Ligand binder design. Structure first.
Ligand SMILES: O=C(CC1(S(=O)(=O)c2ccc(Oc3ccc(Cl)cc3)cc2)CCOCC1)NO
Ligand SMILES: O=C(CC1(S(=O)(=O)c2ccc(Oc3ccc(Cl)cc3)cc2)CCOCC1)NO
Ligand SMILES: [Ca+2]
Ligand SMILES: [Ca+2]
Ligand SMILES: [Zn+2]
Ligand SMILES: [Zn+2]
Ligand SMILES: [Zn+2]
Ligand SMILES: [Zn+2]
Lengths: 159, 160
């Protein structure tokens, strides 16, 4: 199961008080770039209306009955490709989101989350972005692990 | 396909209907799960507390979800397909007369249909399927799970 459309659209519904609007827009745009760079997927940011992937920040009960645990623990959850809720990614605003390392790097979490949005299962490869354990190298460049490039491309193809 | 990536699923009966004794309820639920485990490799273990895979509940009106109960009649019950949290959970409207007989709604028949949902079964267009959207009573310990439901559940978990 995956996206019928190669051209997806996302909308940053709201923001975290931890980062500036640019900081968040850069994090997500860099996050989609991770996947688009290795597939035919295109991501267009939508300011208003319905978007294939609605990005939102919320705490505890936020409208889906998968409540966030608050500070630490669960950080974010995303729904697979599909209508309505599908593609959507929520970020536990009870977490300290960051561009660097102080708390939880948004770009890193968003990339993993968009993996789920594009249909990527959690990986078993300890060195894969889709591996369900948060790790941050601190490096100022991101390489998509081969596990991820393979998994995503097994869905939408390379170039 | 949405299903459970494990054959061993646990279930906890959270609260209880006033209509039947604890044992009537439990028993009716046992039978309802057996309907499915008998035609697939699915194992159902009961939990008296904690997080089970299939949390059963009897609640009226707003009972904690986007599917509020309408009181007497109408929606008799609903269940969620496989998934975390509430996925797989089943809810029965306690404004409906639950029974083990034919007077009122037989907990076993509704539970079985409901459990199919938790397992990943959609509704059938086949007027004979247990998953058929409408309610029909039959009752008999020598209960025959319709061929359709067999084909559907086994497409999910294979045969016994
Ligand atoms: O995958 C998850 C669930 C969690 S998580 O919220 O903690 C989580 C979410 C995103 C993550 O993103 C990254 C994963 C790996 C790397 Cl290298 C970077 C970020 C990590 C954990 C919580 C439950 O257990 C599995 C992980 N959410 O999508
Ligand atoms: O299917 C439903 C919802 C309803 S219901 O609550 O009335 C309902 C619930 C369980 C049922 O169980 C049975 C289904 C078929 C048979 Cl043969 C026996 C019981 C039937 C209807 C209400 C809206 O219309 C479809 C049916 N829940 O799963
Ligand atoms: Ca949290
Ligand atoms: Ca009702
Ligand atoms: Zn959510
Ligand atoms: Zn994840
Ligand atoms: Zn409910
Ligand atoms: Zn039903």
């Amino acid at each position: 199961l995956k996206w019928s459309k190669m051209n997806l659209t996302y909308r940053i519904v709201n923001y975290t008080p931890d980062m500036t609007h640019s900081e968040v827009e850069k994090a997500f745009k860099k996050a989609f770039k991770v996947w688009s760079d290795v597939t035919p997927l295109n991501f267009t940011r939508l300011h208003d209306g319905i978007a294939d992937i609605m990005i939102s920040f919320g705490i505890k009960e936020h409208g889906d009955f998968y409540p966030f645990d608050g500070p630490s623990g669960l950080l974010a959850h995303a729904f697979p490709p599909g209508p309505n809720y599908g593609g959507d990614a929520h970020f536990d605003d009870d977490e300290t989101w960051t561009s660097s390392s102080k708390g939880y790097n948004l770009f890193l979490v968003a990339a993993h989350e968009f993996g789920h949005s594009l249909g990527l299962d959690h990986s078993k490869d300890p060195g894969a972005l889709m591996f369900p354990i948060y790790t941050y190298t601190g490096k100022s460049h991101f390489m998509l692990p081969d596990d991820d490039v393979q998994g995503i491309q097994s869905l939408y193809g390379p170039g």
